[PDB]
Design a protein around this ligand. Structure first.
Ligand SMILES: C[C@]12CC[C@@H]3c4ccc(O)cc4CC[C@H]3[C@@H]1CCC2=O
Ligand SMILES: C[C@]12CC[C@@H]3c4ccc(O)cc4CC[C@H]3[C@@H]1CCC2=O
Lengths: 239, 9, 235, 10
């Protein structure tokens, strides 16, 4: 009736999150023939589908997650999957100003985004988010915490329990610890925590726009979607 | 549910 | 002068800028239809909207921002602000939404309108959260102000000024928690717990906007041109 | 000329 996650120290939380990191995957992107709406969507959804497989492995390695029942785990992933992909992407694109690092062999800049009408405004937000992490010096230890928050948090209020909020608190505790260790003043700690948590609101926004765009692509037969992706979309419901 | 399967594999 | 106010008078100015609780022109004599209930909601919102605009003017730091920026902020935040307002005052009416003192709608009455039950459920959930944490009106007026300032800042520098005043409200939030007797770590935990609910409020707002947009194309109810300016800034 | 902008000016 417990969780070995609730008695982890800060350090142990950071360690277990850093090692749980998924690998960077490559795009099967063939640079010997042009970008088209279909073909870019094809490369992106393909990459999303394979990143997905690793995301699930990773989630089972977030402290306190596998303590949830499957039906909860399912709901959380279903609910967070795109936010997680997005924040990963933004992290990878940090020290590449103006560009999105979908894969080491897939750097796309805002204008490439126009290749798929309806996409460029999502690229725009993703790039805005990259600048903000960049100019606030986001660290990897903070990144992996934010990412774990999005997982446990983004689906917790549509469970219509306290153990998920217990673990969320222990991550808050870890974030502060990291800031104090980096020598931030007490009030610099609480300011920075708020600045990081406030960005999650905007990532949530991007996810909703991204979900509606992907749905549009589907309902216009621009690209096929792996049955896995199709089930992620279906968890959400669009017009 | 493919997700359900992947979650326990 | 907004960066130089004390926590106390930050709180004071916000509690004092609060909009009035408006009434619905609902007639308890003639029963609901999809179109009457929605008409009642979008009428109510058009009115709260004009109050909101004045309240925003009285959020510290707001009129420091260019008018072009003030618009963009209100355009992104407006429904989010509406929704937190609704959740706040529905807080101790478990299972219902107090849209207006004379218009408190139970989870079932959400079905009159197609697609609304879902958004209702997320609203009541959040209201069930505020009550769970026993949110306080002083914290509330901070959340609300934070939404106004945070929601549109990344889709524009005065971004800094905005972040500077956003830090002030953060400071204010913690002041309120320290004074309430919380250990340091209970402070940073509560703060985080509140800020994470803003992501859900953002979610509800994104969902509410798509539904508002579907009721509009289907022409089931007339919106005031104010509400439509607001809507159409989102796509 | 958005009615919002005019409400903000007034
Ligand atoms: C889902 C998506 C395609 C795939 C993108 C994608 C793909 C891989 C990845 O590591 C991150 C992202 C972030 C955004 C995703 C798009 C938003 C709208 C859309 O159609
Ligand atoms: C905008 C809205 C009508 C007006 C509702 C409304 C109206 C007044 C109010 O104080 C709060 C709310 C919250 C939700 C709003 C609806 C969501 C979908 C829709 O069409």
């Amino acid at each position: 009736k417990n969780s070995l996650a609730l008695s982890l120290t800060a350090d142990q939380m950071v360690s277990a999150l850093l090692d749980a990191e998924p690998p960077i995957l490559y795009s099967e992107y063939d640079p010997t023939r042009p970008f088209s709406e279909a073909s870019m969507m094809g490369l992106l959804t393909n990459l999303a589908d394979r990143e997905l497989v690793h995301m699930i492995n990773w989630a089972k390695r977030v402290p306190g997650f596998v303590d949830l029942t499957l039906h909860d785990q399912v709901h959380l992933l279903e609910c967070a999957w795109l936010e997680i992909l997005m924040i990963g992407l933004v992290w990878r694109s940090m020290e590449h100003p103006g560009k999105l690092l979908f894969a080491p062999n897939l750097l796309l800049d805002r204008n490439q985004g126009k290749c798929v009408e309806g996409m460029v405004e999502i690229f725009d937000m993703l790039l805005a988010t990259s600048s903000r992490f960049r100019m606030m010096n986001l660290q990897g230890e903070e990144f992996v915490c934010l990412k774990s928050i999005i997982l446990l948090n983004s689906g917790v209020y549509t469970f219509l329990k306290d153990h998920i909020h217990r673990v969320l608190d222990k991550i808050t505790d870890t974030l502060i610890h990291l800031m104090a260790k980096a020598g931030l003043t007490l009030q610099q700690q609480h300011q920075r925590l708020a600045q990081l948590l406030l960005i999650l609101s905007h990532i949530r926004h991007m996810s909703n726009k991204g979900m509606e765009h992907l749905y549009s692509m589907k309902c216009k037969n621009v690209v096929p979607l792996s049955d896995l992706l199709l089930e992620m979309l279906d968890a959400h419901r669009l017009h | 549910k493919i997700l359900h399967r992947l979650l326990q594999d």
